[PDB]
A paper describes a structure:
To provide a molecular basis for designing better drugs targeting polymerases, African swine fever virus DNA Polymerase X (Pol X) was used as a model for the study. As the simplest DNA polymerase identified to date, Pol X belongs to the polymerase X family and is constituted of 174 amino acids. In this chemical reaction, metal-ion A (MeA) is a catalytic ion and decreases the pKa of 3′-OH, facilitating its attack on the α-phosphate of the incoming dNTP, and metal-ion B (MeB) stabilizes the dNTP-DNA-polymerase complex and increases the electrophilicity of the phosphorus center. To clearly understand the phosphodiester-bond-formation mechanism and the metal-ion catalysis of polymerases, we designed modified dNTP substrates with a chiral α-phosphorus center (α-P center) using a single selenium atom, without affecting the overall and local structures, to explore the absolute configuration inversion and probe the mechanisms of the metal ion–oxygen interactions.
In contrast, when using DNA-II (with 3′-OH) and dNTP (dGTP, dGTPαSe-I, or dGTPαSe-II), the DNA extension reaction took place to form DNApost, and the phosphodiester bond was formed (the after-reaction state, with the bond formation), followed by solving the absolute configuration of the Se-atom-modified P-center on DNApost in the product complex (the product-template–polymerase complex: nat-dG_pro, dGSe-I_pro, or dGSe-II_pro). The 3′-OH attacked the incoming dGTP or dGTPαSe diastereomers in the crystallization conditions, thereby generating DNApost and forming the native and Se-modified product complexes. Similarly, the Se-modified product complex (formed from dGTPαSe-Sp) generated extra and very strong electron density only for the Se atom on the P-center, revealing its Rp configuration and indicating the two-metal O coordination. Further, the configurations of polymerization products (using dGTPαSe-I and dGTPαSe-II) were determined as Sp and Rp, respectively. Based on these structural observations, the Se-modified P-center configurations on the two dGSe_pro structures (synthesized from dGTPαSe-Rp and -Sp) were determined as Sp and Rp, respectively, indicating the P-center inversion. Though one nat-dG_pro complex and two dGSe_pro complexes belonged to P212121 and P21 space groups, respectively, their structures with the polymerase were virtually identical, especially the two dGSe_pro structures (RMSD: 0.2 Å). In addition, the complex structures of the three products generated from the native and Se-modified dGTPs were virtually identical, and the absolute configurations of the Se-generated P-centers on the two dGSe_pro complexes from dGTPαSe-Rp and -Sp were determined as Sp and Rp, respectively.
Author numbering:
A (entry chain B): -1 to 174
B (entry chain A): -2 to 174
The structure:
Amino acid sequence: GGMLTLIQGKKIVNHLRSRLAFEYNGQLIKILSKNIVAVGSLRREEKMLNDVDLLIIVPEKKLLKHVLPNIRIKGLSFSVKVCGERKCVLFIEWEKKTYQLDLFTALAEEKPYAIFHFTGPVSYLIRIRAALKKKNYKLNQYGLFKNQTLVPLKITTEKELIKELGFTYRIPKKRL
Amino acid sequence: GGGMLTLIQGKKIVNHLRSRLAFEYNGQLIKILSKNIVAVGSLRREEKMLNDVDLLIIVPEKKLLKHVLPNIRIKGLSFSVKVCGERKCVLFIEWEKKTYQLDLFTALAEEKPYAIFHFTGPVSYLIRIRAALKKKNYKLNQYGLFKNQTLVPLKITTEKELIKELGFTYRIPKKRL
DNA sequence: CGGATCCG
DNA sequence: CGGATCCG
Ligand SMILES: [Mg+2]
Ligand SMILES: [Mg+2]
Ligand SMILES: [Mg+2]
Ligand SMILES: [Mg+2]
């Protein structure tokens, strides 16, 4: 995939928001715009992007085997590089140029943890996770864990998660 | 994605590749020798249909690992790179108007028997062997035999010698399970 | 830092 | 079973 400007990425996401769907045992099921979250360097508002990252919120665990492996994009030329239930990397054609589109899935209960993970940047996550690891925790895209057991946090949004974990809330573009 | 191949098709592809593999080392084209190219995977196990072609490249110096697969060259053959690093490089190659997957792996000379053992498989066989060794506080991989994170210096050269030294019955590749 | 998908 | 490359 070629590199994109921030505005090019935003235009691609805008286009994709009404055109994502998946095939579920022969039935085309549309993915709702409210369940599509821009993540990665695009959410961090970086001037150039290596690719476009979208997080898809899947409402039922049983649908994970169907969503990314049978992903459909109305009107758009694409091919699949690698694809499973949780990550699907596509090469898309946008105005005669090839760009990389990375799709990820989260369940509703994972959403704040997934948004936190997929926003990055990697350096920031490593720091946060190292600090939590010193206190016998493990943070990932699915939850907060201690002794391989989910720590049930009373939170909904990414902001609530970050503050509950004991860190300073920063907007995506100021996380470093 | 790559299409499936017959055993003969795989063998023909390997035969062709044996004289045509090289790599670029700081602007210098260095040919890979046929003696340092080993057919591995399902091709070595003589399976009737193959999902891809697996080659193990024996690299004579540790310093070359950063150069070999990341600057791989194949004379005359159309290919593209899917994923690539120092130890694994997956290519899609064009062979008689069809696309196939070619998987290249690297081993150092001292790793050769271990690498051949690993890359021959099948997976079920390796899991069984490794589970048994794990019970005795060993760890076997493509690079060596280890105990307490330390290389167990075995006095062996070939894959057959390794298998017997590990305490297992030697079987030819096609009879491993 | 931690996991996904892939490699035998 | 154990590791590589790539994902944030
Ligand atoms: Mg990205
Ligand atoms: Mg991406
Ligand atoms: Mg193979
Ligand atoms: Mg292979």
